[PDB]
């Protein structure tokens, strides 16, 4: 088998469309996703033209072996997709309609500078390459784009699924190639993180401040380093949910800034001892009842200027 | 080959039937479970119909290349089931019995509100997509619903495997297709939640409330403090076993209200030491004497509210 | 390719059998085995009978596809086997003998009601359906079930390999089944789990009992706190080894009941620590210097009678 | 099909090019990569040639299996590739042009000794074995080597992907074998080390050092312990994402040196205590005032001699 | 196809040859290793014999399924190796080349009874069974038995990969089985352990030894206890790495050991503050600077005795 031929010098435009069935297993670490859909695709081959009248039949059924079908593949893949053709209809005017349902891993980017607040945009790229007989182009066809109404991401809100109509139309290899952009938009349920992460780190951190209504150094030293190491299991928790960035994530930043009242809360907690110890309580009880009010008072304008930085 | 031709206007009825072998690793994060079973397919051809005087034969066995066999998917995997045709077996009047053995990972949303004294309906969804020559429809053969005596699936109990017979038809890109849905009944066994993560969060809680019994702050800051962090490895060790949700879980609002708990404690140890240290005992040890109270009173009550809500 | 027809009305006969090559991968949690092994088959089909003065040949070579075989299934199997054919050889008669050498992950459920001192007994069924023509039954050459010499299951004694020689005959979805069952008995090596686990479990429980011979209420208060959070720690790492179970294992009995001795601990903690603040420590003498020989003699009891409850 | 003939006694030069369109899953414990990539393959056979114009085509495609392909490994491959031809163009003096897309999970060892600022070289190689026919020699075409601008590797830069000219020419199983050396040039994003490990670190460890300004030896030992076992869980943490070495590691001779700093200070905490409880305390108060300039200055510079060490 | 046949009675030899290309993935817990390499086979097919001066070509070139070739199977394999023939040269004797690049997962025991100072011997057993035709005998190529030098096995050092030349000839199933035993001399880098796990947990055992130079029981109480639990964790990790053994591991030892001398120090502590509490110092202060030497000196011999046993 060989391509259709050209009419004129036109380039064989392939109409396209991807129905989503499954979004399962997105992973964070991995910036994978696994997808489950149809992938339609039509194209005119001439060759197989026909005459209903005659012929009784509207449309003449193909195995995908009997005809031509152009090589179409997706970029940002792990493995080449799991495969099964569905249908091939051929109009008399010669016009294919390929049907096939597949399974594949993508790797797609995710930016996590706003997590677990953080929105994403998946892609879906489909490639063709050109042949030494024609150029092949390819289109999107709205009404063959969309989703199954139970279609569900785990620990995500699905918000649309869309294409960018004009492909990106390039060199590659000394031949043309032919991109499309599918676009999932998705949403984070942070809802989760707020009982088990956020309010118990919030917790332990208050718990610390109580070393601020407290002379006994022995029962400050055990609050305050106690309640790091427990600040410590949280940061572990979170960064193996997460890849390395490049950046700061909201929740690092966060992370990172309450070490930082940690380590203000242990000198504040060691300089009040020093001070009784060398009998100027008077000064140690003013700076702890300053450190009462500054320690939540710059606690909270820190998270303002953090939510300003990231939102 | 091609589909089997119509007498008047009518769709093509397949019969389906599915008797599970084995199930296995139902993973509550994943939202998936693995399936052995017999799929089981009938449907009318009449070019297949022969005379069984004239043969000799009251049976025809078939390979499936042979005959048209419907294209028949599953909606709800992860990738397409690994199948082996068993039989293929035609009567005197063009009736075909078809029977293979598959395999196949199903992902089936779980509702983890009730956790760990949650039950589940798993669906595997059956689906047939209609060709331009005729309209294909699905149906259940309750005789072929079913079973093994031996299916067990770890940590739960299996109480009914069932049919909606009547399939939900829709249009999908121009086409008619049609979908079964099989229904797993399950319910968890929670026996092991109850000497393993509920008890020893009561225990270490109980453990917290020994503070209103003592004097002594810094053993007071030691009881609570360390069973808190005991408290964080329970809630971390549950949250593993459990996907994020965009919801309360029963057990999630039971971890989350203890956290309460000993955030309130730390509040009652601080203000007794506070007094205590400004000279003021008599005060603190009516607040002590009702914390005994208080503190199981609340619990007990707050408890009676979330089972309430929750059951 | 039929079945070979019946000289009177018998069913088909088939000889099986099981050389066990490797053993491996027996997974607790998921209650699985990786087995590797070879699968002999023998059965008379009539239709392949030769002279061998005229094909010069004692002994015919087959290829799987050329001739009939039977459709043997293992019904406790993951997915299908992964199977290679080792010789078809048909002798003049038309006596088939199949060769197969496979590997397979296989189901099979475990008791963990005396681990780590259980002993278990896998399971690998044979299963045949019949077919139209006629009815088929499988049996057992105990000439060809066995195991290597070299078969080793790490973490298990491999105790014997046989086969019940009498199938089940049954029918399913109006056909016969004809199932054979296979033995692995098998026997935990519990060595490693005494200075693992166990030794190290009793060691703490003995230093958390050091408070009886102590008056310092913030030491005791360390000694009882510090090793339950280690006793939590050895409970998690028990439980990650094991599925959950609707029944009380012989390990999960004891670690449940050595938190109950800590929980008593710290009431004998407070309680003396309460007495003596309260200028009695006469009576919290009393108390302490009975716990010296109540914790130990009922730990022993206590320790007996779950003994004698499980073996 | 059989290795085109020589003109003269030259041996088969097949020029070679791989141009990446994705990177993933760089495992530093498995010292992997995964690739997907375009492997293009150029060669003259002279069988194949045509003349244009009675020809009336300029070029001609043909099947894999229709012509003589040569067979092209990777050496440092987990498994075979997965690959699929794109396609085979014959041009009018029998130049071949093959381009397959393929999938590896590529062995390529990785030097820790300055992790986490640390940069590797990524190997791929190409190999070829001679036949009896003739001599297979491997050659890069400069223009169809590369890499695709989306091309990203989670938590590493790529730098440059290149291909050394020049083949290892050499005799394997008394067969010549030709191997070309890709090089995927590539250094680490160090950036989330800061944050995540290193400073979290650094403060545990200036937390220890506070006890240089405290008399309780009590506090002292929660001090300088509790610290500890929070460096005990970031060298865990650390050592978790790394291989085991027969080197030390930038970051391990850094985690192994705080170790140093710990055991010093519980000496410091030890002798402090003794001495004040044998009415020595203006002696330890002159070894604890050094403390707490030696401490600092000698991590100062223990630092910079090992950063000089390795860097 | 059929077997060669015998020119007198003898049985048919195929000379065999492993050469590795890649070893990677020795996994301690599943005692299973991958390996990459070069299966060379070479046997007499007189049936393929023909002249050199008559047919011009010194060497012929067959596709595997034109000719006769031995069913090589590897004994201790997880699944059948994954392999692709290289080549297949025919001498004009009849002497056939047959060469093929595999991949597989290969069950080998290891003996951890002196770990992480541990030698191994892996093995790659390969077997060939007879045919009624013939007896098939295996037979060891020493010039095609080897490894690439750039073989590298992370945490190991690959000492020699030889083969013992005399196979084990044995019936299994009424046939006859040759077996070649093909052994791969590794020896662990033991090195990373030392400042890892060796250093760490020897530093938290000298700390807890500094109790014996301090008379408060609080202080002793959390130095003792708290570097019991950082060396459960030290446990915990190293037997993550390790599978549960019949038998005592040299570390294990070691680990068990250490526990002791942490309960020893619990009853040390505990004699010494009920002595202080009695107004008997002086006796305290006897058995505190008794054990200052003991601990130390017991320590050291009782590693002296447990590295003679093990080594
Ligand atoms: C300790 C720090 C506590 C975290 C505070 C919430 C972070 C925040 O302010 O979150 C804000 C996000 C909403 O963001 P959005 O619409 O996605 O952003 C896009 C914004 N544009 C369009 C303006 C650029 O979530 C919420 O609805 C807040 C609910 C969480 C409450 C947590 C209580 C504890
Ligand atoms: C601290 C919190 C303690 C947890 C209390 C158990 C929760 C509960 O009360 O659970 C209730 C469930 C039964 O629920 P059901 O019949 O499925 O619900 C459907 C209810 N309708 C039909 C009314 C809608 O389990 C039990 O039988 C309780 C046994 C567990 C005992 C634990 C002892 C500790
Ligand atoms: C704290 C509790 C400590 C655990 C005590 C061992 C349990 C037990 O007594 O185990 C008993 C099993 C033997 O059992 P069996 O013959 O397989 O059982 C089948 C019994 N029938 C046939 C009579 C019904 O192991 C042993 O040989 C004991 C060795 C372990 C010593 C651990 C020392 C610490
Ligand atoms: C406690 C120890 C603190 C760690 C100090 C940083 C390590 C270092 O000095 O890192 C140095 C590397 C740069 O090295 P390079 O270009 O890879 O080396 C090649 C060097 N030649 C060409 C000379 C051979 O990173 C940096 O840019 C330092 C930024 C990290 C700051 C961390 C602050 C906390
Ligand atoms: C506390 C215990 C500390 C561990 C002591 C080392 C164990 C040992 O003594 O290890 C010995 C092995 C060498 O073993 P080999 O020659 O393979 O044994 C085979 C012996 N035959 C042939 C006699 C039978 O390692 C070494 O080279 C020691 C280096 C490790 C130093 C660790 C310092 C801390
Ligand atoms: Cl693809
Ligand atoms: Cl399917
Ligand atoms: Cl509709
Ligand atoms: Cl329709
Ligand atoms: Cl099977
Ligand atoms: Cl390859
Ligand atoms: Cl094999
Ligand atoms: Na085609
Ligand atoms: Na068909
Ligand atoms: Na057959
Ligand atoms: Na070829
Ligand atoms: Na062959």
Redesign the interface.
């Known amino acids: 088998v060989?391509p259709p031929p050209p009419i004129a010098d036109e380039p064989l435009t392939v109409n396209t469309?991807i129905?989503l069935?499954?979004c399962?297993?997105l992973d964070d670490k991995?910036?994978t996703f696994?997808v489950?859909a149809?992938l339609?695709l039509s194209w005119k081959d001439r060759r197989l033209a026909f005459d209903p009248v005659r012929s009784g039949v509207?449309?003449k059924?193909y195995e995908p072996e009997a005809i031509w079908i152009p090589?179409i593949?997706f970029?940002?893949?792990?493995?080449?997709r799991?495969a099964?053709v569905?249908?091939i209809?051929v109009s008399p005017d010669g016009t294919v309609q390929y049907?096939e349902?597949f399974?594949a891993r993508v790797?797609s980017?995710l930016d996590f500078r706003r997590y677990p607040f953080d929105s994403q945009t998946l892609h879906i790229y489909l490639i063709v390459?050109s042949?030494?007989?024609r150029n092949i182009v390819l289109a999107v066809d709205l009404?063959?784009v969309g989703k199954?109404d139970?279609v569900?991401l785990?620990?995500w809100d699905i918000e649309s699924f869309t294409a960018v109509v004009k492909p990106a139309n390039f060199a590659?290899?000394?031949r043309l190639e032919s991109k499309l952009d599918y676009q999932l938009r998705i949403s984070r349920?942070y809802?989760?993180?707020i009982?088990?992460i956020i309010?118990?780190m919030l917790?332990?951190l208050?718990?610390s401040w109580?070393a601020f209504?407290?002379?006994?150094?022995?029962?400050n030293?055990?609050?305050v380093?106690?309640?790091?190491?427990?600040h410590?299991?949280?940061?572990?928790?979170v960064?193996t949910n997460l890849?390395?960035?490049?950046?700061?994530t909201y929740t690092?930043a966060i992370?990172?800034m309450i070490?930082l009242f940690?380590?203000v809360a242990?000198?504040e907690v060691?300089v009040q001892?020093?001070l009784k110890?060398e009998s100027q309580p008077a000064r140690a009880a003013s700076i702890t009842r300053a450190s009462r009010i500054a320690f939540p008072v710059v606690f909270l304008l820190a998270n303002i200027i953090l939510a300003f930085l990231f939102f």
Chains 1, 2, 3, 4, 5 share one sequence.
């Open positions: 060989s469309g129905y069935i499954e399962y297993s991995a910036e696994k489950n149809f339609s509207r449309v059924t090589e593949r970029v940002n893949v792990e493995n080449a799991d099964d569905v249908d209809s049907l349902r399974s790797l980017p390459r042949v030494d007989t009404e063959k199954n139970d569900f785990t620990g590659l290899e000394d349920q809802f989760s993180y009982p088990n309010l118990p917790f332990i208050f718990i109580t209504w407290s002379t006994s150094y022995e029962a030293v055990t609050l380093v106690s309640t790091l190491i427990a410590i299991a949280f940061n572990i928790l960064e890849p390395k960035t490049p950046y700061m690092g992370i990172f070490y940690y380590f242990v000198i060691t001892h020093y110890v």
